[PDB]
Fold:
Amino acid sequence: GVEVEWLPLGEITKYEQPTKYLVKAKDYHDTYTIPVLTAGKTFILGYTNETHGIYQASKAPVIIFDDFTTANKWVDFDFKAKSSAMKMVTSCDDNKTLLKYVYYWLNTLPSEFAEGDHKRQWISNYSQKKIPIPCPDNPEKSLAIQSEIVRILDKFTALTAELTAELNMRKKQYNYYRDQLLSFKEGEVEWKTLGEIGKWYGGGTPSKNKIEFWENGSIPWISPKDMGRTLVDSSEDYITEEAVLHSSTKLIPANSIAIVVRSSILDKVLPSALIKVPATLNQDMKAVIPHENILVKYIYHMIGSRGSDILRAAKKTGGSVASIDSKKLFSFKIPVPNINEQQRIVEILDKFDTLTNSITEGLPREIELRQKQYEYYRDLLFSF
Amino acid sequence: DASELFKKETNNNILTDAHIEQIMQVFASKEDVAHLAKSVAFETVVANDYNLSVSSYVEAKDNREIIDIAELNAELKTTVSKIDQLRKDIDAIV
Amino acid sequence: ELHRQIWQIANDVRGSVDGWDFKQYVLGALFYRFISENFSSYIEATDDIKDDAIKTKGYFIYPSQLFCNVAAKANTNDRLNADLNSIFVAIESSAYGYPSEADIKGLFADFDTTSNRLGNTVKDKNARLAAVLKGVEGLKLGIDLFGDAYEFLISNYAFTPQHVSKLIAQLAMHGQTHVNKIYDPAAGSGSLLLQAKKQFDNHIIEEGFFGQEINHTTYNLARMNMFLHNINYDKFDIKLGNTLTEPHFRDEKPFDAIVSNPPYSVKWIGSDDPTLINDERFAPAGVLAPKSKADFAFVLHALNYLSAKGRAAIVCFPGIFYRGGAEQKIRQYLVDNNYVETVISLAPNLFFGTTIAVNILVLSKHKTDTNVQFIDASELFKKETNNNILTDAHIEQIMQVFASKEDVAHLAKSVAFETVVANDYNLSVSSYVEAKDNREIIDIAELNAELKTTVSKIDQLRKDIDAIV
Amino acid sequence: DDPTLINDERFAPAGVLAPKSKADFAFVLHALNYLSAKGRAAIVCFPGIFYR
Amino acid sequence: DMQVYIANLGKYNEGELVGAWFTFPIDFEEVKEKIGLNDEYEEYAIHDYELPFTVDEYTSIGELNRLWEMVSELPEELQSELSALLTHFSSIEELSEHQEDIIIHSDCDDMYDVARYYIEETGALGEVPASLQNYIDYQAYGRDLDLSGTFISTNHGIFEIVY
Structure:
């Protein structure tokens, strides 16, 4: 603490490369036991961990990714592979280091390790120096005096991992809860064909050669890369209010739902957004406005519930970029009950998913706050 | 058929023998087997606009979980989370 | 207006084949128009414009000594597009051989051979190149802004853009009112040589814009490129040939500014079949460049042809960095004397037809001694499609830091020679100053954390009321 | 429709010819031309020939 | 197999030249008594050899025993292609400095497969969408990997000298 010496990195560090492998049989299905692990998310599906030159990841070294990436680190979790880029960083010394300490102390250098600019490899950079080290406490009580902060950082990283785990748990339980409750409604709950709730609108797009129709303005121009979000308040592009002269767009009210119809689906769940501003959107998506028989959040969450079947309702329509057409999107019939059982049940379901995600009163943004304060308290390490 | 159709080994080597025999086997007399396709009506295919091949694509990858296991896991992880957050709050000494 | 006539060129020439086939025909017709207008404005500068075949051989020797072509008789472009739409084709195939009479002296010629007869049938050829000559005649060019259309038409999609070339020119040109200038190994076009006389008609002419180039079809368009820009004639040449295997000029002379743009790692099987280990230029390196990385052979050839006053400004792909000991000893010989002065990084892509970035070496036999490894990644305005432009008063910041060895952060600075021999002779690591790093405050983050815990837990307990099965 | 393929032996029962760059149903009409009252055709297609 | 024909500086006329084969390590005295002398000690005329590298006719035997240690230190896939590595390096000592930098692609055989390895297996540029996975140019990316780094192609695989 008071006796901190800047020791070089490779003084107590053994660097090596992964051995020879055949880690890829031509089918790598989930039923096998070792996880194929890379950068980003360290989990691809199962492989068999024997008779392939395996390193099998003994008791906690760390790794490097990658050529040209140079940022991602991992603690070897239980016993995993060496998949094609896991060049090993570990320790020669085994009574001072406790190299999860220096794993944490890679986050004492994101300063020079933030700018990966050219085509580049940084072997000598981690190979030489430096790191502040509580030496001259070798090997007596250095782990004992860093035991405080490693208890702190272990429980905080554990907090982050379990918060991601329980966020998965809340989303999983709530996705089952969407399908259990609010469905199969009877009786006799009325049956409404889609679009009869209110006349939905098509789209519209200007040219991009027109500079005066694209450069400035104040209408939110909603593209599907802006989509996938909930409670849309603005857009990336603030397109011109004059640009509606050659847009074929329609001005929509301030309580609408926005929904894409182009190729995010055919595999997965469709996007859906509450849009709060009068906006205009391109050919790549659509907007629906309801009318007079409803609550608008009931249409939103009814489409969100029935997404798993309206991805199927006009599913193929050819194997092209084309998708669910206007017809079988339009010609699906939904339950619409008595009036008091619109705003009651959506008051529960809105209250649940505003607790789940974003942004006001949402859990992963809180997790990001925790990651920010955790990295700041890692900047509150023993530098003193 | 979408699988199998052994499309795994590079490149899509090979729909083996006794593997197309299932394909020929259902083809024999007009059978109707799920997770796989079946017969349709002529009136249904003139009702639709003459497509290929939408029906059936039977409902894979859909799994539902039981309430009480998920909510007991949820409440126990909240107890662990809250004792660790108050442990953080003692350990939030500036 | 400029872009009006530029758009006229960009539309009114494109018919009806691949651009790298009618390239030769359109540029040859435009070049024939320039020869016609230049020779007419010479002989008419008193208004006897409509000429006559009475040509004065005792006078018709003097522009053959002066402009190197008594270009015509009544056989110009002005006399040909009015008398166009007539049999036959090869009046101009003779009237290219006749302005190449020109044997005395300093030919710089045998030149219009790219224009040919194909075509499939001869009347189709007549109609097509009559349309070509008429479309070149149908241009609003007047009288001195001629070569701008040539520089636009050579810039096709398929070439060393004008702002990077301006940067290479301005780097090699400051505090130097001297002679001669300027040499170029592997010139390609005459583009990057041309930004001297774009400015340096100011004091005097110095000597000829020298150069050497490999590909003959590019050699022709290069020799007409610096012909159209009203440049004088006698020493203002390019010689055909490879600079490594067939170097000239050794005899003349140590230069005072050189520029280049070598291609990325062209192969050359030279090491070690001739006496290039004991030649005049590769011998002080101690080794030849390896078997497919030609670039430091170009920079050794560059430092060969340079005096005790001038300076070299060449480009490189950034990959020629360490590349084993065969390149480490070339970098060692460069830093061992005070040859190398300044490297410059530029941003990817910045180029027609590549992906990777570049670097710029500035060499001098001129001492301080320290290596300002002045970098740039942004800006470098690479945003507007594709990566244009390094505008004016934007490279002036680059030249401005380059002025006297300054040391400015978020940007690079000088280093120590002992530091760069301590490191293993790199380019260009230092400095890479510390962007995108931001830290927050304790109390704001933790108050936000605790209030969202209160709201989240009251929402979770209200969820637990609403968890009725 | 440059020759009499609108009134030929095989494309006339279709009522139209195949369009100008999608030859595949011209192949399947040519296929069903040369087949008796007993046999059967087995041809392949790109899956895009769907509605078009 | 990795041997020499070292005799003799005596008999410059080489009348019934002697001295057949000596593997490594090499004694001075055993070879000297095998081949005799010219009444004094001037020997090791390196006439013929069989080595993975090139050596001159005046090299001392101690330098041969010095080089044999570093040659026999390396694995066989390096020892099979020592001249190919010498086309980029300059000495066996310099190869011994950087003997762990060389990455060996036994699987890959040409630049298309090297690009396919770096993209599909590693994900050096990022994740690969499956609908994109066929529409990725490998030849131009292979040419730019060639012009960026330093790759050497042999019979076994591809040697990559990394920095």
